[PDB]
Amino acid sequence: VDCTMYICGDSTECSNLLLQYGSFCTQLNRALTGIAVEQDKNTQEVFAQ
Amino acid sequence: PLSETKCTLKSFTVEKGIYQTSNFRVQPTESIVRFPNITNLCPFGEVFN
Ligand SMILES: *[C@@H]1O[C@H](CO)[C@@H](O)[C@H](O)[C@H]1NC(C)=O
Known part of the structure:
Protein backbone atom coordinates (compact mmCIF):
# COMPACT_ATOMS: atom_id res chain seq x y z
CA VAL A 1 0.00 0.00 0.00
CA ASP A 2 1.56 3.26 -1.17
CA CYS A 3 0.93 5.47 1.85
CA THR A 4 1.08 8.93 0.26
CA MET A 5 -0.97 7.62 -2.67
CA TYR A 6 -3.70 6.24 -0.40
CA ILE A 7 -4.10 9.23 1.91
CA CYS A 8 -2.97 12.12 -0.29
CA GLY A 9 -3.09 10.90 -3.88
CA ASP A 10 -2.32 13.53 -6.56
CA SER A 11 -2.27 16.38 -4.01
CA THR A 12 0.84 18.36 -3.09
CA GLU A 13 -0.96 20.22 -0.29
CA CYS A 14 -2.06 16.93 1.27
CA SER A 15 1.45 15.49 0.97
CA ASN A 16 2.88 18.40 2.97
CA LEU A 17 0.09 17.94 5.52
CA LEU A 18 1.13 14.30 6.03
CA LEU A 19 4.86 14.88 6.60
CA GLN A 20 3.88 16.83 9.70
CA TYR A 21 2.44 13.52 10.97
CA GLY A 22 5.92 12.06 11.41
CA SER A 23 6.69 8.74 9.77
CA PHE A 24 3.55 6.68 10.35
CA CYS A 25 3.23 5.55 6.75
CA THR A 26 6.91 4.57 6.70
CA GLN A 27 5.95 1.88 9.22
CA LEU A 28 2.87 1.01 7.15
CA ASN A 29 5.11 0.50 4.13
CA ARG A 30 7.49 -1.39 6.42
CA ALA A 31 4.81 -3.59 7.99
CA LEU A 32 3.08 -4.72 4.79
CA THR A 33 6.39 -5.26 3.01
CA GLY A 34 7.41 -7.18 6.11
CA ILE A 35 4.23 -9.20 5.64
CA ALA A 36 4.88 -9.58 1.90
CA VAL A 37 8.48 -10.73 2.37
CA GLU A 38 7.38 -13.24 5.01
CA GLN A 39 4.95 -14.71 2.46
CA ASP A 40 7.91 -15.96 0.43
CA LYS A 41 9.37 -17.29 3.68
CA ASN A 42 6.08 -19.17 4.06
CA THR A 43 6.01 -20.93 0.69
CA GLN A 44 9.75 -21.59 0.63
CA GLU A 45 9.50 -23.09 4.12
CA VAL A 46 6.89 -25.67 3.13
CA PHE A 47 7.61 -26.43 -0.55
CA ALA A 48 11.36 -25.84 -0.90
CA GLN A 49 12.07 -28.83 1.33
CA PRO B 1 18.08 5.10 -7.91
CA LEU B 2 20.94 3.88 -5.70
CA SER B 3 21.20 7.26 -4.00
CA GLU B 4 17.41 7.36 -3.67
CA THR B 5 17.62 4.05 -1.80
CA LYS B 6 20.32 5.68 0.33
CA CYS B 7 17.83 8.51 0.96
CA THR B 8 15.05 6.08 1.88
CA LEU B 9 17.09 3.92 4.27
CA LYS B 10 18.83 6.91 5.92
CA SER B 11 22.12 5.02 5.59
CA PHE B 12 25.31 5.78 3.67
CA THR B 13 25.58 2.09 2.71
CA VAL B 14 22.87 -0.27 1.44
CA GLU B 15 23.17 -4.04 1.68
CA LYS B 16 22.39 -6.51 -1.11
CA GLY B 17 18.67 -6.96 -1.70
CA ILE B 18 15.58 -5.37 -3.21
CA TYR B 19 14.20 -2.13 -1.80
CA GLN B 20 10.97 -0.21 -2.18
CA THR B 21 11.02 3.45 -3.17
CA ILE B 38 -23.71 29.75 -22.38
CA THR B 39 -24.50 33.33 -23.37
CA ASN B 40 -26.75 34.96 -20.77
CA LEU B 41 -25.39 36.37 -17.51
CA CYS B 42 -26.91 35.68 -14.12
CA PRO B 43 -29.43 38.37 -12.98
CA PHE B 44 -27.41 39.50 -9.97
CA GLY B 45 -28.28 43.07 -10.95
CA GLU B 46 -31.95 42.26 -10.41
CA VAL B 47 -31.03 40.34 -7.24
CA PHE B 48 -29.22 43.31 -5.68
CA ASN B 49 -30.72 46.51 -7.15
C1 LIG C 1 -20.81 24.63 -26.78
O1 LIG C 1 -20.37 24.94 -28.11
C2 LIG C 1 -20.64 23.89 -29.05
C3 LIG C 1 -20.02 24.31 -30.36
O2 LIG C 1 -18.68 24.76 -30.18
C4 LIG C 1 -22.14 23.65 -29.15
O3 LIG C 1 -22.38 22.56 -30.02
C5 LIG C 1 -22.72 23.35 -27.77
O4 LIG C 1 -24.14 23.28 -27.85
C6 LIG C 1 -22.33 24.44 -26.78
N1 LIG C 1 -22.82 24.12 -25.44
C7 LIG C 1 -23.91 24.67 -24.92
C8 LIG C 1 -24.27 24.22 -23.53
O5 LIG C 1 -24.59 25.49 -25.53
Missing part, protein backbone atom coordinates in the same frame (compact mmCIF):
# COMPACT_ATOMS: atom_id res chain seq x y z
CA SER B 22 8.62 6.28 -3.97
CA ASN B 23 6.47 5.12 -6.87
CA PHE B 24 6.65 6.74 -10.30
CA ARG B 25 3.69 8.50 -11.89
CA VAL B 26 3.44 10.14 -15.30
CA GLN B 27 2.44 13.76 -14.79
CA PRO B 28 -0.41 15.51 -16.62
CA THR B 29 0.95 16.89 -19.88
CA GLU B 30 -1.44 19.84 -20.22
CA SER B 31 -4.84 21.02 -18.94
CA ILE B 32 -8.40 20.57 -20.23
CA VAL B 33 -11.37 22.77 -19.29
CA ARG B 34 -14.90 21.85 -20.41
CA PHE B 35 -17.60 24.37 -19.54
CA PRO B 36 -21.02 24.41 -21.21
CA ASN B 37 -20.73 27.57 -23.30
